[PDB]
Symmetry: D2
Subunit: 465 residues, 4 copies
């Protein structure tokens, strides 16, 4: 998922639409904007793409000088309109409250159970809602402090944008697992999960949001505060490996560049003698470019991705698929035929895509296919976001690198060492891990996981199918 | 536009749908499929993306073992449902005829005049409709010979696919201006505008359709006949430079490879000392890869394209635009800032896009923007297809290269030479031009152009706006 | 089907949309409007309801001071876009021609076979296309003389509106089988299939178009000419019995009042003793009111029709249907229980509805159900329009009135006599038939019916299902 | 709004689609269905007509043997997805609950105000949500007993349907202001606001739900407990006068017959010499027939309503409107010209429709237009339902019958008397009001209205516009 907010722009919902649109790769399962004019909160949301939701007719109904928005992921595409964020709570003779979140709370099961016994009913299956109930039951005398202390009760990954009629409150968890960055646009402040949305919108980037920090932004300006001084910096490593758009800079490290270095690191860890380097369209293009350059083997387009495959694309029958019919990716014979191909891919999670890709690449006539992954094996469950998790198996859970080389049928398979990865991304944070979360790879989480903690996706509500 | 056909496959409308979707880049303004079962022709078509047109519920209406499909381009996005192809003409006690075209008949106004005078009424503004009036009024004695001699009355560019209940006729013009290839998929014969459609569907390439050749495909098999032994091979150079999918091989020369060599010719004709090579997303990635390798300047992703802009995407206002809001493309500050960039693009037609890209590139921090273009200047009009024409002004009609350079705002501008273009593509054909059409660049059209000849867009029917 | 036209009103497409909207009852399978400003005809059409076709965004494109529109009936709901009208032909350096028909040409096959022999290809199975081809192939010097002379070659029913950039030509066949009337709305002349359209649009009625008359309406005024002086007036009796909207007046006789008089005839021809009178929702309300008024038995609402059934209404399964789920109509038990019902309907065609209704009336507790039908039996086919014919078996062909009574399960069954039908409508014309077509009742057609005359629906194009 | 539920049928969501369809006239702003198989609740809901909401694909996703459904009214067509019911609240490790309401809680502001002071956040502005919070916070031990005591706190009109995975609880307020009737369909119990739903679906009437009664339906069967003894019968008089479909029986009295009697009362209290009785298409058809019969003046269709006006219908401009273009209703000249017309309407609420109708009738040539109303003046507000209130000015709050006669332009104007009304409907309930709510007419409410009580509409959520 991804979040965007702007306080102090008279066209703030139109800007949130473009901002949210740069973050459209972070989830296509729902989108929504809530805006305040200082008097009242107006909103629109729905399932699907920002263009699908705001066909238009709808961007006209959201007016305000400040707005927050959210782009949402859902594993099983559907989940319900219920969970499309921002969530909005109204209280007459007390105010409106809107909230958006990118992350996953590890103790939300537990908290919902306690809340229901204090007499709470839940309508969504969102972690945002759990926060709404906690602010409301807080005994502190100020919204800033009720939020400030409700965050004390939450465990896990979270980027929250909260907005009422009169101020935007931004908070980043003490590990800083999810990205949140502040930029400026005139005299408006803007907060976004990735800096590429500032590029798109015309906003000058100011700085990241510290782990454990909470910003109150309103007509007086931006106020900072720190709800936790006990911090442990460990950003999601996959943000740099696969999830962020290439033109974002996570902590000042540009994602294209970092990814290119993982191709470079991979080359120096594992060269092969071969004739062509191909990446995989869109996920490993940058790393393939870096690997090819470090190695001197020419960089080629040996896989092409169809640009118009969507939810409306009819998938081929198993029969057509065994007859030869491709769906989103096909190997290109005019480049790979009679060549020894190295296929750089950013990661193997289930094993499925690399297998299909080694086969396509063999049918096109590659005589050797070597697979190079700019990641360590992903062995463990991510408990920090629907987007960063999978409900399907991790073959590294059960297989070795020779058993995975064997399942996908590579002539050879390589992963980056944890050491090469950290070396490659290049953070300057003194500790073992340079301030990054490596738990999917290594098993060691920067967070206490509970016995009750469910895998993020498990929190679903609408069936869809 | 692009056509696709298959005779003898028990799943022919489905195969035609996957075939047309790999040709979707060839036109997004309408799509259609006409299929036959030996008995009656059933058909579905409409305006829009293939997936918009067969949402589904609809491919299940169109059934048969033979099928032809067309993907259409219209400059004024609209044109009218009437112009969406295939065109189906019906006659009880004499048969159905379905026709799809890719090319532009340069003598169609003249032929329509002579036809309305012999009593003809025209429902569309399609050339396809001109061809069907000529078949009906032909006094030759067999369908094959009527098409064969109506083809002789046509001037310009054409790849025609014709289908009745019982056969499929394919014809390629005497210059071979627009492409066509034949493949086989088990026992079925398939025809496509580019070979990438064979790759996707799982069909074996056999050969191209010869300039001046016509194939009669049916249940007996495939028959060839030459309707003109007076041929002058001149294929569209822009097919190679820009229009084809990268994985397609035109006349056995792979399109990615060719473009990459065009980058290597540009590097030796005009190599500059700079820090970064960047292509423009999607249109000049391969030429920029080749330029970069040729030159030893590292290839970066200095520009990004938003994957979700579209006909529903709300375009930003003029105000928002001068506030700095981006639409489909942005430069990536993390790669170009403080750097000297070479921006390699395949072609400059109107000069709008590179003026925008050099600006954005300066705004993001490039100390130098050097623009290298893998084409000669396009100074003359194309009369051989809507898809290969523009209705806006070619500035190299008016501007010298330094006048274009000043206008787009580049530090330098360099185009490929015609000697370097023919050298880069590598066609082995004994003549000045290696079998290509260089008219937009040189002024020498390979067909006669009349004083009555309209430029492709001029033929429109619906307003749309 | 229904046609509407207005010349000389600057808001003419909008007026045509409301005018056609009041004739929507004549056709639910397509709607289209063509308008002219003096230079160009602009048009929009599609399948479905007017409201469906013109969501809006669309009615903004059809701009002009003259417009013609058509509402279409297609039996097997579909036909295909191609048969949706008005048909628009364009011809550079010679003019566009839009045409809309309501009727059926009994010798269309013969004429089409001839035109194909002179080199014509047809794209639609529209009679309008036949007329378009006859006009062009006429030798005459002026559109008026070419039309005048083409109409001579037409046999069957026809109300035609033709339109060009500069004039409208209206023409009605020598029998006046189908109604047309003229109105004036300020200075604009309006033309419509029924007068309710004029009530709805604020136009004043003028007069009926004469059988054999063609009118040329343009900015000079309207001119009447006679293209056939050999007329034998035979209006569709079913226009009066069932098809027209109750507030329309055919030859100055009001449709509700005529139908109510047919209700008073049936009471003097067949008065029975019962308790409650009920018509059927919507088709036989006025007649039911007449039979009750005549009789002194109270008129009740003993059947209800659901206002929200339509194409998007899911039909009950066979299972659910015999469990007792009703679809459009249900008997109101609270009116009919233990009561002797006379149920008045306008006509029995297939036998189905009357069987369904008498079953429900008995299920709701009725003690006797006496069907009274205000029509003679319909025993012969209609060759004068899809809207007035059926593809299904008519039971009065095979069954005597007692066998039809046994089939529908009524206690008694009475049909209006032809003499009562003629006395009931009250047309003042001197001849046997009071100027009415009664072919479907008596077997005798007001027109020559060929061995090549197909039933109108047998002229279909698209499968749809 | 209307509610329908069925317990114990394998095809229960389908039965509810049809049930909800017969009640579609009670509200057109949303539709929802929640089914239970014994293990889990599945739902689907959305704004628009049932046929719009369940296009299908959707109805098949709901599965179970028990289901509840609601059809919603929203004054301003809008309110937002949140207010569309049945509301569903989930709790893992405590069960799901679904609720549908038809009524208005006159004390809900007070109740929300209390709930919020106990830690409750609210997401929708529905009263169903208020009850939800109140059941969860109830100290009692069994769900039955929780509901029993929450209902005791509610002030106003309410017909609740509650459903969990295993039982359906039905409850009607102590005045029975809104109808609920129980029927039986095999062994499945079925509950609906109007009995037409039973007809339409094949359910056999059983008995009405008593006021202050609650029923617990589950696989054991049906249980009944009186949550209140202190009851004061006052059914809505407007259910009889206008709101119910004409085949429903409210309290064993048929709505068309009761309406026809109100027509006969108005006749004996205000008779006139005129030549035509006309009703207004659909609301006053039954009363108009009663008046004509009692008066001996002929009943005619003097006004037609257009069957195809909709949300999607493009409203005429002011200029088109004053040019004479009609919207949903037109007057018929063939019936009323040169005639004295009595127009019987069911009620006058803002005075707009009847001014509009009397003008049209005069423009059609009527000499006299005498308006008779089968209601008293509606001079007071309704605080018991959005469907039975208007947010607009009631003109009998400010105007006398003669000021109203002048405003609407009537030749003469009459309203029924409260006595004539109680007498026409025919309840023999001993008490002054025959067991009816007459507040809108007399100012006497059957309930305590609070100083905090707002008019139903004022509780609006989404802006829409
Ligand atoms: N506009 C874009 N340009 C290039 N890569 C993109 C873009 N948006 C997202 N990405 C990358 O696309 C990859 C995911 O796409 P895919 O794996 O092809 O579905 C991610 O690794 C992203 O970093
Ligand atoms: N958590 C994730 N969710 C979705 N896509 C992922 C995830 N992690 C990585 N990806 C993409 O999935 C690929 C591996 O696919 P598979 O092996 O089929 O699971 C990687 O190359 C990524 O492009
Ligand atoms: N699926 C695809 N993968 C990669 N490039 C493509 C694809 N389809 C078309 N192209 C190229 O994209 C360019 C057009 O994209 P653009 O000019 O960015 O809109 C052309 O130069 C095509 O050769
Ligand atoms: N005939 C053409 N029609 C459409 N796009 C074109 C054409 N020729 C080249 N292109 C694209 O136009 C670009 C030049 O854009 P401009 O200079 O704004 O006309 C190239 O990079 C191609 O992507
Ligand atoms: N707006 C309308 N009001 C009343 N009756 C109508 C209307 N439009 C069409 N009709 C009549 O309704 C009958 C067809 O409707 P139905 O029988 O309900 O399908 C015909 O007899 C028409 O004359
Ligand atoms: N030609 C026709 N086609 C369609 N509806 C018709 C036609 N003639 C009469 N109707 C209607 O069909 C009824 C007879 O229906 P059925 O006997 O089931 O065919 C009458 O009440 C009319 O509403
Ligand atoms: N509560 C109400 N809300 C909506 N329509 C109503 C209401 N009460 C009566 N009606 C209709 O409104 C008509 C009166 O219209 P008007 O006087 O313009 O409000 C009556 O014939 C009813 O059909
Ligand atoms: S003139 Fe240019 S774009 Fe046109 S056919 Fe020739 S090479 Fe192609
Ligand atoms: S045969 Fe019947 S339906 Fe046909 S035109 Fe004559 S009266 Fe009308
Ligand atoms: S005030 Fe009137 S409309 Fe409201 S509940 Fe009472 S009778 Fe009904």
């Amino acid at each position: 998922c991804g979040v965007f907010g702007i306080w102090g722009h008279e066209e703030a919902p139109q800007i949130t639409y473009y901002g949210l649109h740069s973050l459209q790769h972070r989830g296509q399962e729902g989108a929504g904007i809530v805006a305040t004019d200082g008097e009242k909160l107006t909103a629109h949301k729905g399932q699907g793409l920002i263009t699908e939701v705001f066909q238009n007719g709808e961007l006209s109904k959201v007016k305000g000088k400040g707005a927050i928005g959210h782009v949402r992921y859902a594993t099983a595409g559907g989940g319900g309109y219920e969970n499309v964020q921002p969530l909005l709570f109204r209280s007459q003779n007390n105010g409106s409250l809107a909230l958006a979140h990118n992350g996953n709370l590890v103790n939300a099961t537990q908290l919902k159970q306690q809340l229901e016994n204090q007499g709470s009913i839940f309508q969504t299956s969102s972690d945002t809602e759990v926060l709404a109930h906690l602010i409301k039951r807080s005994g502190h005398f100020t919204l800033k402090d009720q939020i400030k202390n409700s965050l004390s009760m939450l465990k896990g990954a979270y980027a929250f944008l909260i907005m009422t009629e009169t101020e935007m409150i931004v908070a980043l968890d003490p590990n800083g697992l999810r990205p949140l960055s502040i930029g400026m646009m005139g005299d408006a402040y803007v907060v976004a999960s990735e800096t590429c949305a500032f590029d798109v919108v015309g906003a000058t980037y100011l700085r990241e949001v510290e782990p454990g920090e909470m910003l109150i932004i309103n007509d007086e300006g931006m106020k900072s505060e720190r709800f936790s001084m006990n911090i442990n910096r460990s950003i999601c490593s996959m943000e740099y490996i696969y999830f962020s758009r290439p033109d974002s800079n996570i902590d000042g490290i540009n994602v294209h560049s970092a990814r290119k270095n993982l191709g470079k690191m991979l080359a120096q860890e594992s060269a092969v003698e071969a004739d062509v380097v191909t990446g995989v369209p869109d996920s490993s293009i940058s790393a393939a470019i870096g690997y090819a350059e470090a190695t001197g083997i020419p960089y080629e387009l040996g896989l092409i991705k169809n640009r118009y495959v969507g939810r409306t694309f009819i998938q081929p029958s198993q029969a057509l698929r065994e007859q030869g019919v491709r769906m989103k990716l096909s190997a290109v014979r005019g480049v790979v035929e009679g060549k020894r191909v190295v296929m750089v891919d950013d990661s193997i999670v289930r094993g499925t895509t690399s297998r299909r890709i080694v086969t396509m690449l063999r049918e096109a006539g590659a005589t050797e296919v070597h697979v190079k992954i700019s990641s360590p094996p992903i062995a463990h469950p991510c408990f920090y976001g629907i987007d960063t998790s999978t409900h399907e198996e991790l073959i590294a859970s059960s297989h070795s690198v020779d058993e995975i080389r064997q399942e996908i049928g590579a002539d050879t398979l390589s992963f980056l060492s944890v050491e090469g990865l950290l070396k490659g991304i290049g953070r300057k944070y003194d500790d073992s891990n340079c301030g990054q979360c490596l738990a999917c790879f290594t098993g060691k989480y920067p967070t206490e996981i509970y016995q009750d903690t469910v895998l993020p996706h498990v929190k679903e509500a609408v069936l869809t199918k």
